[PDB]
Design a protein around this ligand. Structure first.
Ligand SMILES: [Mn+2]
Ligand SMILES: [Mn+2]
Lengths: 601, 601
């Protein structure tokens, strides 16, 4: 077995040289293994994915809109760990509790488990294939709809790609098993949001236009992104044609009062339009928030498993289900099941001890109502300062964030945008620049590549326009983008890229691989060469994958399905073998050894 | 200076032999120092403590009941850290942010900062005087009311004390600066609750009778502790005379729905009675819950600073303040201030890294709706299991907890009671006893000392009676307590105890000390001998206290107020000096050395 030995070499390697992917927090994966509940044999109870197929996104939206109780979505597979564990959860652990979900959470609206950071991190850090993840799970959960976070601007990539790809991406994603597409734009720049809605709607999937939330519509003071701001935007999005409408409060800024307001005026304007609410518990509301949303007529709300909820993540699924039963919005989900599910996750999370923000973050923070830093980014900046004894610092950067944000014309901060305000915020602090010093001396300073490209609109056009008195003194003799960036981009010959990959990585390369390579040229490449020589490192349980094997400890890995592979380390030490070393394993009935390179560790 | 050298010897000792008080989690106190905001010079803005004094608990309650916005209480000084940090926060760090509080949180209803575990821990583990704490803080915050958790049954002790002490306790406490007394009974056994109310009322303080909450009044299924159960209990407590009425949801089981119900029928029955709600965010509601209580007419709700809220503690103060502004329930508290306040606590908590439940607990858990384990006990049992790689176990015990509780007739689990179900739950588990095996074999097994005395009523009589078919087969030829246990207890000759202490510890012993010794004979004794030889270990900053000083690191300690004491370690090594060693400090302008005992460390 070449599949076999490829992995051995790997295990051996991690033993000799240690961890392959970065480990931000010095900690070994919990020695305990996640508790996987029991599940009856045979097919799931069948939930919405069934209806969808049976009637399209058409009847779907209706059933959704006409469902009595509150409906939910599980972000535990995507945004939940993307916010708490540096989006490091591996397919392996996701496949584990999959059969459970399929059997227990059929009443489920959708299940977020793809899109977002994941596509990137899957190759850049976990060395697994994002497509495999999908197919492997779609296989395990045929009854629950699959949702992803798609960026209208550029699918799951980091830069503008020709529009021919956005459609081909969704085309594939759709066939591979994706259903609901949540398209968003960091500036709510419709052009990008509609392109996303296109590829998604044309791919034949469910379009769920997502509006990113800033400030507080309840507060009449601020008028930039006023209630009427959103309301207008919806019209366009609804006209452009969307099955479901979602409100992406990525910063956990939605207050109950603001909620009641927003949703009602929305339910009023669109009586039978499905409404989906996404918030992060960063401020401390979330639950109280979501509850208000239902009250006012919201159809669904995003939640995460208790053990993976709270703080920069989504509100406690169990708290929502609990507070909602006995009422006309009852979710009808057995508390018992949320327990076993959270149970699993509390243990699963134990493996990702090396990526637990829990190291620096011991709770939420209402100051988010001031800096407007989204959940994910919050956690990271927090960890950064504190991880280097600089909590004192964090206060300061947060203030530079506000100024930076105001300095660019008060913005909507999400992946694209949010990270540009970040660099500028840091640029100012690390250079001691008051907003005034920053603006006045703006005629010439080396502002972040991200900031300059933003003002050139590479992403889009901020509502209210660019801070021109400043924008120009910055841009100078620089090319300012005109129109939807992706527009002026010539297509991407897929055959040129296709044989260009077959020619190299193999006669294997699949449509999927092509796309991946497309979005992530290098990262994909590296990911391919790595797995090339190390086998299916994705079938390895997280512990072995991170920490590597323990000398003498018996263990097994399910390669494919006909093999179980029982291995036990025991023996390494050839300290000098021509500048190397050699380890031996007792693979199944026999035994063998692979040679590693000490890398003078 | 004897004050001086006494501390030196201590510091040195810690250097040579290490930590004096147990340290559950191996971690050193953060090297960063909590950020203490700025506070104007001169007197605070004055709040309710002022009104109180000017009009007695009579005008106070009215003002409370007639105040427009929602009122709050800060448990950050007591229940917040008692649930999260093993009640280990020191007076030193409480004095620091005190002036700030006095200046910024005048609108505050009360401030919980005393009572509960504190009195015990203050001597048992921190080696500080609980009275000192009170006096020192009363000094720093003369404008905000001081609240404490007083146990009707036995003030701040662990056993039945003759009622003469219960009155003498509140008498002293009241004069020392305590105002509002929250009196509670673990089984809501009126006899004990009234005794507390008396001492509290008689002492001339504000009586806030507390009803302990269980189950879910919204849920018609369970009828033991039905709505009409509480409603009736209210009548008694109000007739017995109480200025304010509080609901102690020590387990965080209060759902919004159950809330709206409870409070309203309460505000209905008592139009102008002040209502105070206490909850723990354990389930995930809390905030959502409290918001409901207000909606329905609740006058005050307990909260903690953001960095100290969440999980088994109280809801995010900032989340409440945030979601409540702009509405008729506006707290009027400047978001800005809750920020600086949490800012301070996030850092102060970094000093207590050795007691942070954060180590095992990374979030709340809605399964609380099933085991009914109060916030504090949850945290402990969770740390327990997991701190010894036994999370797998924790599930099990939670199950025994339910059976144990059901086995004792379904109870209200708070400090007294709650820990009895604990022992029983663990007894069963650790002896493999189904609730059936536990009961049938009850005729004779060595049930916990706590469980036996419970059935003998040493605490009180459980509503619905004791589980007799069992109770008896357990008790056998054992004495069953008749009436409020404290009643049958002969007074406590205070002079006998007074001269008894003077005679020993010194001609210093104060009325306070007497009471302390009373409730905590030994603990007090040890606490006294320790401080006796080591000086004011309470004027030491938590870092030096826990971790001791760092060789060559310059530092200072504010002994009293006329001395600043600048010390620098540097030099220890007399490894063998007659089985000891010797360290040297460079105290202020001069230098000197103290001789320690290596304890063959
Ligand atoms: Mn999000
Ligand atoms: Mn409590």
């Amino acid at each position: 077995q070449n599949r076999a030995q490829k992995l051995l070499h790997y295990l051996g390697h991690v033993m000799v040289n240690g961890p392959t992917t970065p480990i931000p927090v010095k900690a070994s994966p919990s020695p305990t293994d996640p508790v996987v509940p029991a599940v009856p044999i045979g097919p799931p109870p069948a939930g919405f994915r069934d209806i969808l197929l049976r009637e399209g996104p058409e009847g779907f939206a209706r059933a959704v809109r006409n469902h009595p109780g509150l409906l939910l979505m599980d972000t535990t597979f995507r945004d939940a760990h993307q916010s708490l564990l540096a989006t490091r959860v591996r397919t392996h652990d996701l496949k584990k509790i999959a059969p459970y979900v399929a059997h227990n959470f059929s009443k489920l609206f959708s299940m977020e488990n793809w899109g977002g950071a994941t596509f990137d991190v899957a190759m850049r850090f976990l060395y697994e294939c994002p497509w495999r993840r999908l197919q492997e799970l779609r296989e395990l959960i045929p009854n629950i709809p699959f949702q992803m976070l798609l960026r209208g601007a550029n699918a799951v990539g980091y830069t503008n790609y020709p529009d021919n790809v956005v459609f081909k991406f969704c085309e594939v994603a759709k066939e591979n098993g994706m259903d609901v597409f949540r398209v968003f734009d960091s500036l709510n720049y419709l052009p990008n949001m509609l392109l996303g809605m296109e590829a998604a709607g044309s791919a034949g999937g469910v379009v769920e236009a997502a509006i990113s939330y800033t400030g507080d519509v309840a507060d009449p003071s601020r008028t930039k992104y006023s209630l009427q701001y959103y309301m207008g935007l919806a019209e366009e999005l609804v006209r452009a044609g969307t099955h479901i409408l979602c409100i992406k409060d990525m910063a956990g800024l939605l207050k109950p009062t603001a909620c009641t307001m927003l949703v009602s005026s929305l339910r009023d304007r669109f009586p039978d339009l499905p409404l989906h609410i996404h918030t992060h518990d960063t401020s401390g509301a979330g639950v109280a928030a979501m509850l208000a949303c239902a009250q006012a007529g919201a159809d669904v709300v995003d939640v995460a498993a208790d053990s993976m909820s709270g703080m920069t993540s989504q509100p406690s699924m169990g708290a929502l289900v609990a507070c909602t039963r006995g009422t006309p919005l009852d979710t009808e989900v057995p508390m018992e099941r949320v327990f076993d599910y959270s149970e699993y996750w509390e243990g699963a999370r134990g493996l990702y001890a090396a990526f637990d923000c829990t190291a620096t973050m011991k709770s939420g923070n209402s100051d988010v109502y001031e800096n407007e830093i989204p959940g994910g980014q919050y956690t990271n900046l927090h960890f950064q300062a504190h991880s280097m004894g600089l909590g004192s610092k964090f206060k300061e950067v947060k203030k530079a964030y506000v100024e930076a944000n105001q300095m660019l014309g008060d913005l909507i901060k999400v992946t694209p945008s949010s990270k540009i305000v970040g660099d500028l915020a840091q640029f100012m602090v690390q250079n001691g620049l008051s907003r005034a010093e920053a603006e006045a001396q703006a005629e010439e300073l080396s502002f972040p590549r991200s900031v300059v490209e933003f003002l050139q609109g590479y992403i889009g056009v901020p509502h209210g326009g660019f801070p021109e008195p400043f924008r120009s003194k910055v841009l100078k003799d620089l090319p300012r983008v005109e129109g939807r960036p992706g527009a002026s981009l010539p297509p991407l010959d897929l055959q040129a890229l296709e044989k260009e990959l077959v020619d190299r990585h193999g006669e294997e390369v699949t449509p999927e691989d092509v796309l991946s390579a497309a979005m992530y040229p290098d990262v994909f490449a590296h990911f391919k060469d790595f797995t090339a020589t190390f086998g299916p490192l994705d079938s390895l349980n997280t512990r072995l994958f991170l920490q590597g094997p323990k000398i003498a400890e018996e263990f097994e890995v399910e390669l494919e399905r006909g093999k179980t592979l029982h291995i036990k380390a025991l023996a390494v030490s050839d300290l000098n073998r021509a500048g190397q070393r050699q380890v031996a394993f007792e693979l199944n009935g026999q035994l063998r050894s692979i040679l590693v390179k000490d890398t003078q560790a």
